[PDB]
Design a protein around this ligand. Structure first.
Ligand SMILES: Clc1cnc(Oc2cccc(-c3onc4ccc(-c5nnn[nH]5)cc34)c2)c(Cl)c1
Length: 237
């Protein structure tokens, strides 16, 4: 992810087949002749899509030009949460499934994984960052506190941001409960709130493993529900 001052990010396509698949996903959803009511509603929850981009002197070098979801914030606090029970897709090999499950074997049980967070602290004028190893360390015993960390500004728990996050996730959950045409593996929610009341972004990102389906994305729904339940419990701190 490269942040552009014009308020966009450039995401370089991952190697095949993942990068091409994410390109086709955006192309399908933001197709200018799409009157699919499911896909039209989905746009609300994605970064705005500005199409494929390449450098003027390098058409080989493929990027997606996406809305920077953090742009409108002064001191954005950002958390990426991978959603679902499985982060391997329907066409993974035994070896690939093993790789994905071993990365975080609690995915089936918990239904989400924190990929990282960046939290602005007021009383130090600085950022705390957590990497992939933070979220992969969390167990069922520590997931509530693991998530709570995101909402600590070094003086209070930002229950406004927690409440707002529940409300926005609920809308995404409603979308998933009214579609049976896409299943999403190893995709994420990007949470943003203002670190400098109730001003929040919750957006879906990372679509290298989205597949056509005939059924409810039961794994994604479980993840959303469990995440909402955790956030709800935090409101009682
Ligand atoms: Cl925990 C964490 C949070 N954010 C990260 O990268 C950023 C930082 C600031 C903004 C973004 C961001 O802002 N808008 C975004 C739209 C899409 C993506 C994206 N798509 N696929 N992977 N990332 C990322 C987007 C991403 C990172 Cl690398 C880690």
């Amino acid at each position: 992810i490269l942040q552009h001052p014009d308020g966009t990010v450039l995401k370089q396509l991952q190697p095949p087949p993942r990068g091409p698949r994410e390109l086709e996903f955006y192309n399908m959803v933001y197709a200018a002749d799409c009157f699919d009511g499911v896909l039209l509603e989905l746009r609300k929850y994605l970064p705005k899509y500005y199409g494929i981009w390449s450098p003027p002197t390098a058409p080989n070098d493929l990027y997606l030009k996406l809305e920077d979801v953090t742009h409108k914030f002064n001191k954005p606090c950002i958390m990426d949460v991978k959603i679902g029970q499985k982060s391997y897709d329907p066409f993974a090999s035994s070896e690939k499934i093993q790789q994905q499950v071993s990365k975080y074997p609690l995915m089936e049980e918990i239904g989400f994984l924190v990929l990282g967070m960046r939290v602005y602290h007021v009383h130090s004028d600085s950022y705390e960052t957590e990497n992939q190893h933070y979220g992969r360390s969390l167990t069922k015993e520590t997931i509530k506190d693991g998530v709570s960390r995101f909402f600590h500004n070094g003086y209070c728990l930002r229950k406004d941001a927690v409440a707002a996050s529940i409300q926005k996730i609920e809308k995404i959950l409603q979308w998933f409960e009214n579609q049976k045409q896409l299943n999403f593996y190893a995709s994420s929610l990007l949470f943003v709130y203002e670190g400098s009341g109730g001003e929040v972004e919750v957006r879906m990102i990372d679509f290298a493993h989205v597949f056509p389906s005939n059924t409810i994305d039961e794994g994604y729904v479980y993840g959303l529900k469990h995440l909402i339940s955790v956030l709800r419990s935090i409101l009682d701190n």
